[PDB]
């Protein structure tokens, strides 16, 4: 199973559990036709660390950008070698059964490459969603429609 894409992004906690903070972590993302998984990146050795998350591609119903937070820390506010792994201001979402996984890219070009490839892979799903939430689901509700359920029907036609 070939690795379609491999990048270092910033991600928001999916807060699956109740006892989970709303924090961001740098992770190494790999995209195969079967799964989108992320690991801790071992910077020193220059390799991927322990798998920290995974999502079966057949469970993805939607992939799209997402309106930026209005007050982003410097870490997410809009030389290359360093900035491309320190600054992640272009967010996008990977929607599936367990709410949305938010991912922050370093450049707009990269987010485009990913969003384009994730669409080719999900093209094979039997029931993609026609709608989605354009804004972050932050603080118990969707800032784009105010619905509460993470997996609440998207408040906007694709
Ligand atoms: O700090 P802490 O390590 O407890 O934060 C967790 C971290 O945000 C996890 O993300 P990853 O390290 O990328 O795995 C969160 O899990 P996910 O976003 O689902 O991957 C974790 O919360 P949940 O597991 O959703 O319960 C945070 O506690
Ligand atoms: Zn919405």
- Model resolution, angstroms: 2.6
Run of H or E including 114:
helix 108-122
Which residues line the pocket of ligand 1, CB cutoff 6 A? 11, 13-17, 20-21, 23, 25, 27, 52-53
Ligand 1 atom at minimal distance to the Cα of residue 101: 18
Task: Name residue, tokens 């784009």.
Answer: 144
Return all residues near 70 (Cβ < 8 A) that are at least 6 apart.
Answer: none
CATH architecture of 1-158: Roll (2.30)
Give long-range contacts, CB 8 A cutoff, 24+ apart: 13-19.
Answer: 14/53, 14/98, 14/99, 14/100, 14/101, 16/98
- CB 63 within 8 Å of CB 96: no
Is 70 labelled as part of a ligand binding site? no
Domain boundaries, the chain: 1-158
CA 38 – CA 14 distance, rounded (Å): 13
Task: Indicate the DSSP class of residue 58.
Answer: G
CB atoms within 10 A of CB 23: 9
- CB 57 within 8 Å of CB 122: yes
């Amino acid at each position: 199973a070939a690795v379609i894409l491999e990048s270092i992004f910033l991600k928001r906690s999916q807060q699956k559990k109740k006892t989970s903070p709303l924090n961001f972590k740098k992770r190494l993302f790999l995209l195969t036709v079967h799964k989108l998984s992320y690991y801790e990146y071992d910077f020193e050795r220059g390799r991927r660390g322990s798998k920290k998350g995974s999502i079966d591609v057949e469970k993805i119903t939607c992939v799209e950008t997402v309106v930026p937070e209005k007050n982003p820390p410097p870490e997410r506010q809009i030389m290359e070698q360093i900035s491309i792994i320190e600054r992640f201001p272009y967010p996008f979402q990977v929607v599936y059964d367990e709410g949305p996984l938010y991912v922050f890219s370093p450049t707009e070009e990269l987010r485009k490459r990913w969003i384009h490839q994730l669409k080719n892979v999900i093209r094979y799903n039997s029931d993609l969603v026609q709608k989605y939430h354009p804004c972050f689901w932050i603080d118990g509700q969707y800032l784009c429609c105010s619905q509460t359920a993470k997996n609440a029907m998207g408040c906007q036609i694709l």
